[PDB]
Design a protein around this ligand. Structure first.
Ligand code: ZN
Length: 62
């Protein structure tokens, strides 16, 4: 005979949704109005190209 778990224990606490917007690279408070950069099929914004590119990590389980 034998046994198993086959369970997925999940439980975390965090803010349902953010209040303000920040760069996904430098994490800077983008003033309301300033233009933001967004990649294709992605929900991440950036302050400027310099970051948009920097963020890109590469071939890492992605
Ligand atoms: Zn940035």
């Amino acid at each position: 005979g034998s046994s198993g778990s086959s369970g997925q224990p999940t439980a975390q606490q965090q803010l349902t949704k953010p209040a303000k917007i920040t760069c996904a690279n430098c994490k800077k408070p983008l003033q309301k109005g300033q233009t933001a950069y967004q990649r294709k099929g992605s929900a991440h914004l950036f302050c400027s190209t310099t970051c948009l590119s920097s963020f890109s990590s590469g071939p890492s389980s992605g």
